[PDB]
Write a protein that binds this ligand. Structure first.
Ligand SMILES: CCCCCC/C=C/CCCCCCCCCC(=O)O[C@H](COC(=O)CCCCCCCCCCCCCCC)COP(=O)(O)OC[C@@H](O)CO
Ligand SMILES: CCCCCC/C=C/CCCCCCCCCC(=O)O[C@H](COC(=O)CCCCCCCCCCCCCCC)COP(=O)(O)OC[C@@H](O)CO
Ligand SMILES: CCCCCC/C=C\CCCCCCCCCC(=O)O[C@H](COC(=O)CCCCCCCCCCCCCCC)COP(=O)(O)OC[C@@H](O)CO
Ligand SMILES: C/C(=C/CC/C(C)=C/CC1=CC(=O)c2ccccc2C1=O)CC/C=C(\C)CC/C=C(/C)CC/C=C(\C)CCC[C@H](C)CCCC(C)C
Ligand SMILES: C/C(=C/CC/C(C)=C/CC1=CC(=O)c2ccccc2C1=O)CC/C=C(\C)CC/C=C(/C)CC/C=C(\C)CCC[C@H](C)CCCC(C)C
Ligand code: HEC
Ligand code: HEC
Ligand code: HEM
Ligand code: HEM
Ligand code: HEM
Ligand code: HEM
Ligand code: FES
Ligand code: FES
Lengths: 395, 134, 236, 395, 236, 134
């Protein structure tokens, strides 16, 4: 029964405290589902990678003979669990982008949520590495070369800068770090496999746990902006169960329907067809831009004429998210409450979608001009947050 | 004192453990640099003869010619990364040297004379120490 | 209301972003090759029976091992270079694992799959006249269908000089005075498709189960929604 | 500083509640360290397996060429992290045996700790599989054959029993389950590798977390036996910090010293020398008994003349630990309070050490007689717990 | 006290259990072979210099490649069967990875390590007279030292008929009228030891760091103990 | 009804997901049984001739002899797992058949006549269906 487990585990005292008397806000909108959806996609990736690790082999002469021959034809339902994996990777990138952007919107990074945003940025940085190093593994014609392209980006740092041209042969993230040093060999493939498969998901679970605890410790920020009305204002909370637990439970099922649509009926873009060719280190494909979640940065890169300054802009665009809680400082919180932050956020969103879309097209001079025009608008959102902050402080 | 001695000792232990972990995982040390020396004695290659080698990856040529793109002027000894351009074949020596996959021709300095490939072979860096090319 | 404008903007932009990011990016100019339409039914159903009790896939397999196995080694089906015949062991190909080709979902005990490193060391490292004469090894036709497409595979074979400017692969099926080559190339492409594409029994089970899974999750979501709506009435 | 992190994460409110005002018992003895030591050894195994997964390769033609050539000679400090791994596996078995046996001693399985013992038995069962499937991986001369010996044990079940001889070709844990079916091939090695390396440690972390929560939910059982004196009896708790947190912190360091002794100076029994020969499926080694943590059961096996009944005894000796909380029922708790349970526990401990020691010697008829005499004493401890329980109920 | 009897029983039994379970189980009767004591210094220090500027390990390597590489393929050092010489490529052994033998902690660019499946398919599957005449392939002497011991390796070689009753491996160094064979076999065993045992520089660094780690953890434990003792006095 | 319809639906979904997971991970189905049939036509083997095959693993012999351990009496067709005993070599046919590694001899029924091996070759099970051995 349940009373026997109740007396020994206190299951009902945990249930009545975590669900029935939690008292989340009532006016929670739809983009407050993206965290639960990212957690569900993380679970999907773990469950479907536990199946792939049984048959994938981190050898150069055996990779792409496991993931393409064994996984796809030899193993029952192996096609399905590679489809689920390669679809959930892209869905997990997209849901995390939506989550962090509609957390930027409601400004869920202000007091006292400065630390949850730092842990979330660590989540994002290590997720980039988990989805970047897991793409070399199929060892396809463009997988190898998109790993090479992405691992030579830290090499433009060593190129002679405008100032102090001693950066040559220093911070060698090429030789020491990934690409293994002058050759991508079997040892490097095994190292990337092991890291991607067990070192990164463990520090993903740890950081997701810390993040979920820090969300509860600071409380869900309501989208209105008053951020609380303590000891008063009832009839606007309608506690967690069953108001929210069944709304999220329906959004999760509908999201899984949209997910298993791509898994079954349209995967010709998650398993790209010209990646089904075994990689040879002598023939370079034509269009070898990195994966879609890194194209918004790859367009800021290789658009500035200097490569060192392009890499510096690449890194500044990623560092301006750690400082983003420390960068915007105002008593006002939401975007329903800041009419000047809404226009900057829409500029940021549009000009950040446009960068990822320009990152797919071939590098023409007009494409470079457009990617620079949009990079200027992306940087404007960060170099104007303190201005709007200083304006709103004077009301 | 103890409440700081244990802190210093734990810090030294953590530093050593992190050093070991880095040395195992993140270190292709002294085996990735294969090869930055690439001893290639110049007095062994004959005129109008190419020696196949490997520098910073595969592959590399060692061309020597007595007389005469064109990045460098007459030095008579140099090295070009030998892999065809537009589809990545290996050109054979012999006076131009071509690759028989598609028909791409190459002058001993890298440029193309009959080009299926769009661009010539990029010259990798080099150093001259007596009779040894890098 | 203004919230509605916010909704159909912040959702419309995301939908039209993921649309042209995940299918039909209209700004990429990759070219398209198509089957000659002369037959276009040899390739649609490679498992379609014909006379002499042979399907099109089996006949394409024989055409491939007879006219194409002299330089190309289609593994994943046990086809290797005919020099020597067969290029794998000779003697014990079973003592390699080396397992018999067990694709979806039926195994073929008469053909074996040899790893990429065991092969090309026993076979092509006692090098025969392929890398020497041609210049490049005819790479592999195992997963070339999934990587090129039926259109590119058909338009490449029977006219390699048009798709690629210069290529030491011959015409080897010359049309415009041999009217019997187009269907041969179609059978070859249909065979190469039958190695990487599920049969009509398996490609249908996947469709049925993928429809049932989506119809399962949609119904489960709407059932949970109706349950929440009903439970919020007993309380308020 | 710390106040900034305090305001956003509530770190001091967690510290003062989990350490300073926890109020554990004061009279806790030494064998109450084995849980913390098993947790530390679990951490050691995870940390040192994250390094080994980078270079181990789950192919028949490449296994024992990674773990013996690459790991040991090619990789810097790889010898050290294979030594730590193969030593921590045996230390993790030994510490878990000590923990569960000195938890049997103080009867930490009675009310209300029935569920923590079930979760602990699940820990033990899945730990057997994690240490059993991880031993096939080096692919040594005796590793392969000790996997074969252990996976043919469920095959004696199919042998014609005394009753209902239809068990032939049913419950085929040989073909379906491990050994892959009639051949240990490359696919089976890859499957065992993937499972051992990521599927078993994940359900180890989950179960260890559930176990640690269930220990707190039921409270530490004090070794005396009164099990509490609620609302009274002060001056005998001396709360968790710094009374216990620094006693455990010193025992952990001394245990790690004893551990790194074996890691560096004596490992000729954790990496057995005749396991450094590449496995061939045609030559069987002489003495191929399973690993030491399974020898106490392997001696109950292959000592009874019947193989089916030997396997049934193997399984009953393992099932009599799940029922052990439900098997012993008495108001008295400790072994300092039950003078009749102490003698049965010492019989159990001695006759269970003797079984693992007899499991190493070759199978002579005298060895079989001794292993049966000791198996009788092991079963006596389980078929007498209800008798002592019924006697003590009448006081 | 009675608690003391409980302590030195429940700890004594566990200690004497793990003793004869983890080192020197006195009830296992595995036999022991020992070096003939004729030299016993050729094998103790294989890196010990000799005349002609050659160490004993290098001389054992030459003796092995000259008299033993005709049937045994000691990989992990680049030694393969001399038929053909060398049995690996011939031509491109570099295009296999195939990497140069990089042991602890110095690499040898003149010898290459070829995987087990690439080898024995290029080499022994164009089978020469080893599996036919002998009956079994001379397995491998790469990690035979770690698996047998110096005593077993010495007593096996120069008298294989004594260790194993019948074995098609010859004496190949016959004593009792050739007094120059014992030191040759000792040099061979010393070479085979130098492939799997750290040099005197590396086997010493491991000892020093293993002493320092234990002395670190013991001191840390006793420091934490003294800190707890001191902190329990400020409170009580 | 809904509060039980969702329970039944979730149970069916969990059952299907567990079926898929089992079918991928824990199933060597229909490929592990290689081979339990092992078609060996008796009318192809000649008298005093042995055919090398594999049953339940490697290896297996197919011995046929016209006239005459000894588990079975005269059947003239049977199968023995052919791998030497004390060190695991492969005996060669030819009238006894021995293995040349150590000199172990074997009678066509399995027993040893000059034994370096301690025990003979264990007879694997067999079935007779017309002219096909299992
Ligand atoms: C068969 C089916 C096919 C399926 C096709 C694929 C599926 C597509 C579905 C995706 C739909 C996403 C919906 C998100 C929007 C939710 C609704 C909304 O409108 O979200 C708004 C903000 O959310 C927010 O920022 C979040 C929205 C902004 C996020 C921008 C995402 C950019 C994507 C990545 C960009 C690359 C980044 C590069 C690195 C810098 C809410 O603003 P409010 O002022 O509170 O309005 C209140 C009203 O809603 C009252 O009801
Ligand atoms: C260089 C250095 C070399 C190192 C060599 C290796 C290291 C060895 C160290 C191991 C020492 C272990 C110490 C355990 C004993 C702790 C002390 C003790 O005595 O533990 C007793 C009980 O613990 C208990 O059951 C626990 C004891 C019983 C556990 C039995 C373990 C059996 C092992 C596995 C058996 C195989 C099982 C097979 C499957 C059935 C405590 O009983 P009390 O009545 O409360 O006494 C109170 C007094 O102590 C007051 O102070
Ligand atoms: C997926 C399969 C499941 C199995 C997974 C196993 C792991 C965990 C099991 C699941 C957890 C069980 C749920 C227990 C929740 C009950 C906690 C609780 O509710 O107890 C609270 C204590 O919380 C407290 O100390 C908080 C204690 C500190 C929490 C620290 C843990 C967070 C980090 C964990 C993530 C890993 C990373 C670790 C590295 C740092 C009491 O509340 P208070 O604030 O003190 O009182 C104030 C009142 O006004 C409100 O109540
Ligand atoms: C450094 C020293 C290395 C030698 C120093 C240098 C000059 C010598 C030079 C040197 C020596 C060689 O033998 C060597 C061999 C092969 C190639 C190269 C070399 C070499 O260059 C010893 C390092 C090994 C120790 C044993 C680390 C243990 C391995 C891991 C398993 C530990 C993981 C640590 C985690 C991340 C923290 C967890 C904290 C937890 C709460 C416990 C706290 C205890 C303590 C850590 C404070
Ligand atoms: C069954 C059905 C399979 C077909 C049924 C049979 C006859 C058809 C026969 C059949 C069809 C083939 O196409 C096929 C192909 C190749 C070889 C053989 C076959 C075959 O034999 C679909 C199974 C696939 C579904 C898509 C499972 C999803 C895969 C995992 C990633 C899910 C992991 C589930 C975990 C363990 C529970 C987590 C619960 C969490 C809270 C969410 C709850 C949502 C829901 C699970 C209730
Ligand atoms: C004369 C030897 C030879 C013959 C015979 C041959 N091939 Fe080729 N194949 C080649 C060469 C050379 C290339 C060029 C490789 C390249 O351009 O990268 C090639 C390339 C290809 C490609 C891939 C080209 C690309 O860019 O994707 C395909 C597909 C192909 N051949 C199909 C076939 C088929 C089908 C047959 C049998 C009907 C065949 N070939 C017979 C040698 C041959
Ligand atoms: C006549 C061919 C031949 C020659 C030459 C040869 N071996 Fe052997 N080796 C064999 C055979 C046959 C065996 C038997 C394998 C077995 O019994 O399992 C063997 C076995 C061995 C073994 C392992 C035996 C065991 O049971 O562990 C070692 C070690 C060994 N030989 C060493 C050497 C050395 C060192 C040399 C060179 C001095 C050498 N052999 C030369 C063929 C040869
Ligand atoms: C958590 C977020 C993760 C992301 C975003 C991610 C991403 C990816 C991607 C993009 C691929 C390429 C697949 C393809 O191109 O077909 C991949 C492959 C792979 N992933 Fe992950 N991964 C994640 C976690 C995991 C986990 C937890 C495992 C656990 C085993 C895992 C195991 C694997 C394996 C073995 C492969 C190679 C198999 C194959 O290529 O088919 N991954 N991953
Ligand atoms: C695996 C990845 C992630 C998981 C599982 C996850 C999970 C969650 C969940 C469940 C919530 C609460 C529900 C909600 O707010 O929708 C949340 C909140 C939050 N997350 Fe994440 N998240 C992830 C990634 C990220 C990233 C990458 C960032 C930032 C770069 C981030 C920043 C935040 C913030 C600021 C909040 C607070 C929302 C608020 O208070 O309104 N998260 N996260
Ligand atoms: C948690 C308890 C675990 C136990 C008791 C255990 C046990 C073992 C054992 C006995 C071996 C054999 C090593 C040898 O004989 O030299 C081994 C190897 C291995 N373990 Fe574990 N293991 C555990 C967890 C893990 C984890 C978490 C990982 C994560 C990567 C892992 C990865 C490996 C790998 C890759 C090998 C093969 C490497 C080699 O053989 O040198 N193990 N394990
Ligand atoms: C990875 C394996 C394990 C870990 C990390 C672990 C951890 C712990 C810890 C830290 C404690 C509290 C401290 C202590 O009692 O010493 C505990 C208590 C306990 N454990 Fe475990 N344990 C493990 C395995 C087991 C096993 C295999 C069993 C039983 C078969 C078990 C049964 C118990 C019981 C009954 C208690 C309660 C002790 C009491 O209340 O006095 N544990 N465990
Ligand atoms: S590959 Fe050299 S010409 Fe195309
Ligand atoms: S192998 Fe046949 S006698 Fe030892």
């Amino acid at each position: 029964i349940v009373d026997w487990i109740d007396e020994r585990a206190h299951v009902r005292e945990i249930y009545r405290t975590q669900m029935v008397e939690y008292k989340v806000a009532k006016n929670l909108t739809f983009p407050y589902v993206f965290g639960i959806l990212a957690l569900v996609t993380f679970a999907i990736q773990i469950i479907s990678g536990m199946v792939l690790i049984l048959y994938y082999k981190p050898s150069i002469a055996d990779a792409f003979d496991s993931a393409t021959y064994s996984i796809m034809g030899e193993i029952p339902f192996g096609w399905l669990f590679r489809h689920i994996h390669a679809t959930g990777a892209n869905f997990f990138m997209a849901i995390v982008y939506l989550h962090m952007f509609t957390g930027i919107y409601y400004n869920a990074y202000k007091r006292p949520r400065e630390l949850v945003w730092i842990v979330g940025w660590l989540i994002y940085f290590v997720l980039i590495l988990t989805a970047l190093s897991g793409y070399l593994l199929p060892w396809g014609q463009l997988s190898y070369w998109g790993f090479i392209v992405t691992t030579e980006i830290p090499g433009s740092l060593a190129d002679a800068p405008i100032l102090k041209p001693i950066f040559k042969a220093i911070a060698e993230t090429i030789v020491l770090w990934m690409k293994g040093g002058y050759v991508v060999t079997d040892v490097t493939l095994g190292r990337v496999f092991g890291s991607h498969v067990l070192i990164y998901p463990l520090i993903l679970l740890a950081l997701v746990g810390i993040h979920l605890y820090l969300v509860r410790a600071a409380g869900i920020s309501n989208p209105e902006g008053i951020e609380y009305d303590k000891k008063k204002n009832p009839d606007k909370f309608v506690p967690f169960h069953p108001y929210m637990t069944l709304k999220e439970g329906a959004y999760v099922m509908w999201y899984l329907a949209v997910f298993f649509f791509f898994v079954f009926f349209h995967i010709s873009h998650f398993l790209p067809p010209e990646n089904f060719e075994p990689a040879n280190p002598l023939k370079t494909p034509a269009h070898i831009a990195p994966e879609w979640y890194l194209l918004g940065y790859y367009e800021v890169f290789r658009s500035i004429p200097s490569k060192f300054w392009g890499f510096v802009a690449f890194n500044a665009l990623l560092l301006l998210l750690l400082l983003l809680p420390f960068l915007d400082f105002s008593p006002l919180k939401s975007a329903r409450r800041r009419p000047l932050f809404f226009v900057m956020f829409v500029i940021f969103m549009i000009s950040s979608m446009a960068l990822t879309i320009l990152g797919t097209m071939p590098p023409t001079p007009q494409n470079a001009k457009l990617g620079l025009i949009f990079a200027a608008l992306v940087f404007a959102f960060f170099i104007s947050l303190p201005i709007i902050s200083f304006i709103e402080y004077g009301w | 004192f103890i409440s700081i001695g244990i802190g210093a000792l734990g810090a030294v232990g953590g530093l050593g453990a992190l050093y070991a972990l880095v040395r195992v995982m993140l270190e292709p040390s002294e085996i990735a640099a294969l090869g930055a020396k690439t001893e290639i004695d110049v007095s062994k290659i004959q005129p109008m003869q190419v020696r196949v080698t490997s520098w910073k990856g595969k592959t590399l040529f060692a061309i020597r010619l007595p007389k005469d793109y064109e990045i460098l002027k007459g030095h008579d000894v140099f090295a070009l990364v030998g892999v065809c351009t537009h589809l990545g074949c290996i050109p054979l020596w012999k006076p131009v040297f071509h690759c028989p996959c598609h028909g791409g021709l190459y002058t001993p300095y890298g440029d193309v004379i009959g080009g299926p490939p769009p661009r010539p072979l990029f010259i990798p860096p080099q150093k001259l120490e007596g009779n040894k090319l890098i | 209301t203004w919230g509605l404008i916010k909704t159909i903007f912040f959702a419309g932009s995301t939908l039209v972003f993921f649309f042209l990011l995940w299918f039909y990016n209209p700004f990429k100019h990759v070219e398209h090759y198509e089957v000659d339409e002369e037959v276009k039914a040899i390739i649609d159903n490679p498992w379609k029976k014909t006379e002499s009790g042979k399907t099109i896939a089996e006949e394409g397999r024989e055409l491939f091992i007879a006219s194409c196995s002299s330089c190309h080694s289609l593994r994943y089906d046990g086809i290797y270079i005919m020099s020597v015949a067969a290029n794998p062991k000779w003697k014990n190909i079973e003592k390699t694992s080396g397992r018999p080709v067990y694709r979806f979902g039926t195994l073929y005990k008469d053909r074996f799959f040899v790893p990429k490193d065991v092969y090309e060391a026993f076979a092509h490292d006692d090098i025969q006249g392929l890398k020497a004469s041609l210049g490049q090894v005819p790479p592999d036709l195992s997963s070339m269908y999934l990587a090129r497409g039926e259109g590119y595979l058909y338009q490449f074979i029977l006219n390699p000089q048009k798709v690629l400017p210069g290529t030491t692969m011959p015409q080897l099926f010359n049309p415009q005075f041999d009217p019997q080559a187009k269907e041969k190339v179609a059978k070859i492409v249909a065979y190469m498709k039958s190695v990487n594409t599920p049969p009509p029994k398996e490609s249908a089970k996947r469709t049925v189960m993928g429809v049932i899974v989506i119809a399962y999750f949609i119904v489960m979501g709407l059932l949970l929604w109706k349950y929440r709506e009903n439970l919020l009435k007993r309380l308020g």
